[PDB]
Amino acid sequence: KLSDSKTSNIESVPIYSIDEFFLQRKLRSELGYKDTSVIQDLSEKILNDIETLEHNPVALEQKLVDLLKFENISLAEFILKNRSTIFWGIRLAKSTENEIPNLIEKMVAKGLNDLVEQYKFNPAIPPVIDLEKIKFDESSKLMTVTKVSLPEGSFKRVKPQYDEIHIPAPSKPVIDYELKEITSLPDWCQEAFPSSETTSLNPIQSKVFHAAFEGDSNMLICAPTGSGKTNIALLTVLKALSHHYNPKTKKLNLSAFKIVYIAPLKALVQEQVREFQRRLAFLGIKVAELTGDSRLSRKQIDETQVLVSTPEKWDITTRNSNNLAIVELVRLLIIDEIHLLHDDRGPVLESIVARTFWASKYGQEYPRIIGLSATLPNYEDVGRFLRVPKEGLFYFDSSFRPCPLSQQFCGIKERNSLKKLKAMNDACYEKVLESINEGNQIIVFVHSRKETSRTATWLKNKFAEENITHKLTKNDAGSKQILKTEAANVLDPSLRKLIESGIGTHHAGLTRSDRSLSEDLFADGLLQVLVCTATLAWGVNLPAHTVIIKGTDVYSPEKGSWEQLSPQDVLQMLGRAGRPRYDTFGEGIIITDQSNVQYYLSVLNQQLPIESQFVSKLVDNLNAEVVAGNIKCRNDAVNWLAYTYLYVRMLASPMLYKVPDISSDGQLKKFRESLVHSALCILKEQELVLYDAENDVIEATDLGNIASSFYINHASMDVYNRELDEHTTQIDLFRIFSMSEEFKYVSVRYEEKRELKQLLEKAPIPIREDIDDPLAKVNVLLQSYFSQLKFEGFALNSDIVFIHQNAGRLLRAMFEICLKRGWGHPTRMLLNLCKSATTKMWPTNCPLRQFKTCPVEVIKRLEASTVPWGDYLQLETPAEVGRAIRSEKYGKQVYDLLKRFPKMSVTCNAQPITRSVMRFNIEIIADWIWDMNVHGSLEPFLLMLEDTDGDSILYYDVLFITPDIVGHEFTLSFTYELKQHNQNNLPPNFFLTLISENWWHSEFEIPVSFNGFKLPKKFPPPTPLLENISISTSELGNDDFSEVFEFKTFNKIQSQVFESLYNSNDSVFVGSGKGTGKTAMAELALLNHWRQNKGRAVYINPSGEKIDFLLSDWNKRFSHLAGGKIINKLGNDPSLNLKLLAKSHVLLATPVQFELLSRRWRQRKNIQSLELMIYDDAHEISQGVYGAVYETLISRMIFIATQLEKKIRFVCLSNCLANARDFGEWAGMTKSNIYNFSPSERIEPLEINIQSFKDVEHISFNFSMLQMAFEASAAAAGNRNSSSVFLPSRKDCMEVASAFMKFSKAIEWDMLNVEEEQIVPYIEKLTDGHLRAPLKHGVGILYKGMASNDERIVKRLYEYGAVSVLLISKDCSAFACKTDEVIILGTNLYDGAEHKYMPYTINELLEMVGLASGNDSMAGKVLILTSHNMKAYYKKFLIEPLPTESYLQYIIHDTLNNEIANSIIQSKQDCVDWFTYSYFYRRIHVNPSYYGVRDTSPHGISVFLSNLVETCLNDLVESSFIEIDDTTEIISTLSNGLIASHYGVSFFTIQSFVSSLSNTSTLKNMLYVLSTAVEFESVPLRKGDRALLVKLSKRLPLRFPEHTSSGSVSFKVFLLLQAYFSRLELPVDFQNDLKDILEKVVPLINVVVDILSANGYLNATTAMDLAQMLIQGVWDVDNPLRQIPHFNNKILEKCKEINVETVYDIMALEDEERDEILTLTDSQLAQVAAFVNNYPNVELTYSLNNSDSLISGVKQKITIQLTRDVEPENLQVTSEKYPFDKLESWWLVLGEVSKKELYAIKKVTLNKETQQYELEFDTPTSGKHNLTIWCVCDSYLDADKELSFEINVK
């Protein structure tokens, strides 16, 4: 443990780590005595002083101060704290014969504490090699053979200034194959080849056709200059497309299919993207240039199938693990210009090909490997490299060129400098005039940039001197016209004069339009000569008859000098020689020095060998692989090297690669080992990787990851690692930058010295380096680039270009390094430096400059204003903007930009979970207009939490701002384990900074917590268990009880609490780990409660599944043994539930369900009749709102026990907690029996594994985790321990199932875990097809919404051992299929609420973990796969349970309003009085920091409560929920709040409804209003489901209002309720979402209608009509028979024929009629009977006490009699669509239709066959009125009855 100072972990030492050599190591290392003997004697003396000193630690401290020479006191302190521990620890390790005495001696010497503490816990020889010796010393000339061979017909002609060595054009070849005609091809590809001039493939393209199109073999095609690579590629592309094209379907699967094209330069890449885009458009395939210049633009790249890119972008892409997801998809790889293997880039291509054939692993399929090459020797070896058989290995010579190319080599002989300029110029003019005089055009390549125009001038003047006739025109009447007319120049450069002489200049730097209009002139035959830069050879396809190369000797900043033109450039340039259709032959001519002669010949006549340059970067490519985890020992690298070109070429030729001994090693194993070690130890010593040389183990480090993933050379990384201090400031960073390997050879030429010094003098950032020093040059040029200066010299320009080219990735690497080390200012500065690096601007410049569309004149007025830029942002009007910039015109413009500038507003706070842990909660709003044109698809932001100083970085993350989160402010939270320094001494404040990754002066930072906080006191100890092999079924009084538990023995931890449960009648708490058996504990309390004949018993549990099981379980074991009725509860019908409570001895309910009853304990007598209440899984009283309600419940029951004096017994069952004391005192527990055990108290052994993976914290999971998981799973299955895997969702289960099939079907372990024969019948149980083929291969699946039969089958099959691999959706944690081993794949799940990925929490994960119990002696095994940001937290809180805090603070309005409603709380004081019974109140005192308490003092807490309540009460009266009768004052409930409390709806939902519902609102509007309820926030919102909702919105008529976000759940609800009304077929997800939605509707629509009916708005009758639709699952507009169960369209249709519409006609239907209509099965028929024979029929009889004599405005009473045809046995409503219970309730309504006024209304339950109700109403205005009485049912349709009558008013 490395640190600048002593920590408590470093200080204390355990015995087992104190080995036989510990002390001397520690002394020697700590003190610094390299010599052995010194420490050898010293340690002896120290231990002797420890031994013989029978005094004290002080005397030893003195003696140690003496021996350790008064310094290194921390060492003395190490010795002091571990005096006896080390002193005896060093002894025990020497021998057992010494040990046996030493334990006794140590025990007798009172050392027993340390002993209990103790009990409580390759034959390698490395050969060094010189990498310099291995790399080729011959420099630019890789000529391995001086002997060149020319074809006959060639000849040498000597001339005064040069030798002309020329070779004639090659003869046409005689192929013995007939070419494929364009029409001879298959049908689906005819447009892959244009209506060509020849309509046939050429010989090269024809011979290869077989394997290239009909076969799928890997291959290497080596062909001469310009072989039409496009078509050759297209053939193979078309072949790859084959096995994805559907058989009969004339369409093509553009999924699970990708192709890639690798080309040397980006230009050619773009050219091929163009040539492959429109060319393959007809197939519908999309092509793309791989935006490798963006790592964010690799997520959206997936929509394209054809990728064209550079080797480096591809290498980075494939190397970075995050992209491994889509690598498997590729099945075709075309490498263009493979012959670069000899070039410096080769190692990359080699690395890629190596990568392909290396980590195939599970894949077993290698993509189509196809290489396109030039004709050069060693094509043989490239074959063995690329795995090419002879069936694909092809080789063509110059003869098969589409246009034969003649050669002429000009060898200049000059000794003079300038005279060579005329040597080239005269030799050029010789050939310019030679060619042009022969009636054809020419093209010329130059060595530099502007040189093209300098050469153009010389040639123009040389002809003006003489001819100017051959280049003038081919016809002055029809050519010089355009030359003088349109071809005459409009463009602006000097070309105005040049172009008129018939010459061209394609300079890489001219305006695009100029270039276009320029090359179009050479194309159309006007210009007779085109001079150009190299770029033309790579980009635009513009052929010419003769090509001439001038210069050849080119400058290379990488080497800081000059080198000969590379072979590839020459070949590519000659790639533009000739015109196939027009010319019979082409021609190439070269101008070079006689020193070169043979080299360019060896290039252009098949002599240049292809040798590997891999060694040069071997160390880098090795590092990359080690990072990938593909190398862990030497032999991995040894095997890795076998897939390289180097290897093959070494095998083929050991004498050229300098291998000493192939004689012994012939396979080159030993050599590979040596080389591998030789590189690996360099990586070791440079701190890239960690390597144990002897024992063979390799582990990549942060630096290695940064090195590989950011594509940096190891040397630079070393420099950065070693030079970069934590104290580094701006000035040093530039020097650190300069020292990079990339600037190794930056020569400070004296020619440049003057011009440089001019800059160096006046640089804005100090440079300590002298003018004659590379570092200074680099620094200057970079700082110059940041000011975008201009230079005249080519030498300077090329250099600064190179610099600013690499500066980006270098600086990014530096930043990442600084961030990983946690150094503030370095990263802070470096980010802005990277920004300046990319944006060409200093932080002193105004960001308006950064916009591509901005006011030019405005900015310079701001840069020179001295005014803070941030002050312009708050100018909220174009006027002030116009003022600020001194312009009306540009004000209106820039105003829009200010409003479009990335800016945010943030706020946050601190929350101490526990002493050592601080939680940070932040809330952020993004405030700008997302102008896509500039912002792009995404704006990243660096989030950084740092210390007081701004030095050390505490926490960091990256926030990704997308378009649809702007304006939509949101929250985020994270964990920081508090610094041990700060933990003891409170610091003032931290700083939370947020800065844009690429926008200037967006930075905004703020402080955190500060205002003072009290950290919770460190947790007290748990209560361990004393020895028990005790308790039995016979300790139970009744023998009948003994037959319940069966297992005579009681579980270990379970037996302990027995006495205080089975016997004692006291309030009791049991916190026991989940999986230990609390379920069985609960039963004892009941058995005691029962045997003593107490009374009604209430079992509470939020876990629905467990309730559902327990009901089905208990009445099979308990009901008939003592006369008890057990029954559960559906909260959806409180009225039913009340009766269920009254009608049962014991019941099961969720917290909210029972709370819904208890919230009127005042009236409901059967509440206080209770005596026993069991509170299972109580730990969830902190689980949000439902938990807050759960808290409120038990709080109430306490309050009831108090207020009604009669005591109630509380039996709380929970999992492991923190300080149970609060929970105990809260529930009035006897402090004696509030048991609380720790997690590590499990009755069985559990072994939890946890693994961290990088770059997954913002996604579900990745490939490595999947592989890991399946490895662990199969490995577990191999040992008869079946495995259960938890996944985020069903989708993932399916995908992972497929993954299981491919994974298994490619290895040894791959079985069903059972016979392949006996299992077949169960495949016939496909009630869900999805599970067919997966389970068929031995993988079980489980998901929410699964059919009952499926779940039965699969789970039972799993238990039978039919499958050891179980896949479970997180949702189904409830389905507790306990197993031998559990796996957790990913801990993140996306949520559209917070608009990001959300992590698993302790409870879910724990509930998952609980499912572990190895067969008897076997340990239960758990594997958790997660991210780096979470591992610490999980391992922290899974062993040390998280503190249970109160969520109650969020539901204050609801509970307060409810308590006010029952007139329990009447005064302000009574609120606080009530609060005293809550966990919140007892918990806010022990951690006032967590709950936002302003003052830590108890006084402050009381103040907090007072202020809280006051604000709440004001909030309540604000929206008319309560009324405060002033004076003590007294408070009373009002309508809205009374409704809220009555039905149990959130305050804000009510508020929303009130201010949204109107007298003009309609059915649609009421639906929309309904969908906005707060209660729907718990409804899922899966990633991308919106797309599905849009698809549904086109099937449904009602339109969601466009003036609200469709990324909200209200949208989903609004649509799905319609889908429910329309009985529309839905997905498996939406139906569960639908069920969840429907669960919460019944007591909501009642609130709607009750709101409406209170204001006298007759519209209430609408909301009712809505209520019916919700219960029968149909629009109230359809045939009254559709609501009947199973009445399909056939029956519905038949009913027309018999003239039947109403339900009444169906029950009145004769039997002989049913037989011909009801074709349904018996069950369905039974349901039909169940619906029909309960369909109510009522008769309405109004009886007004006096039908005329009413006083105006007097409250006249009317009596309404409701009668029923029969006595109803059961008001249980039936509906095949509504999946709950419900009463048949009726609305009585009295209102005036003409005035839309409802006079009276009454909600009733029509139980008796006849009854009557009294209503009273306000007599309306004087005159006469038409009153109408409705009687409607809220559960059925078309059974509604109405009456109307006239009234007269005085």
Swiss-Prot record:
Gene3D superfamilies the record matches: 5' to 3' exonuclease, C-terminal subdomain (1.10.150.20), C2 domain (2.60.40.150), P-loop containing nucleotide triphosphate hydrolases (3.40.50.300), Sec63 N-terminal domain-like domain (1.10.3380.10), Winged helix-like DNA-binding domain superfamily/Winged helix DNA-binding domain (1.10.10.10)
Any one GO BP annotation for this protein: mRNA splicing, via spliceosome
Positions annotated to bind ATP: 223-230, 1072-1079
Residue span, SEC63 domain: 700-1010, 1533-1847
CDD domains: DEXHc_Brr2_1, DEXHc_Brr2_2, SF2_C_Ski2
Keywords per UniProt: ATP-binding, Helicase, Hydrolase, mRNA processing, mRNA splicing, Nucleotide-binding, Nucleus, Phosphoprotein, Repeat, Spliceosome
All residue ranges annotated as the Helicase C-terminal domain in the record: 420-623
E.C. no: 3.6.4.13
GO molecular function, one term: ATP hydrolysis activity
Reaction equation(s) it catalyzes: ATP + H2O = ADP + phosphate + H(+)
Entry annotated with the keyword Transferase: no
Domain Helicase ATP-binding: 210-394, 1059-1235
Residue interval(s) of motif DDAH box: 1176-1179
GO CC, one annotated term: spliceosomal complex
Function comment: RNA helicase that plays an essential role in pre-mRNA splicing as component of the U5 snRNP and U4/U6-U5 tri-snRNP complexes. Involved in spliceosome assembly, activation and disassembly. Mediates changes in the dynamic network of RNA-RNA interactions in the spliceosome. Catalyzes the ATP-dependent unwinding of U4/U6 RNA duplices, an essential step in the assembly of a catalytically active spliceosome.
Note: Present with 1440 molecules/cell in log phase SD medium.
Family according to the record: Belongs to the helicase family. SKI2 subfamily.
Free-text note regarding domains: Contains two helicase domains. The N-terminal helicase domain has catalytic activity by itself, contrary to the C-terminal helicase domain that may have a regulatory role and enhance the activity of the first helicase domain.
Protein name as catalogued: Pre-mRNA-splicing helicase BRR2
Species in which this protein is naturally found: Saccharomyces cerevisiae (strain ATCC 204508 / S288c)
Gene from which this protein is expressed: BRR2
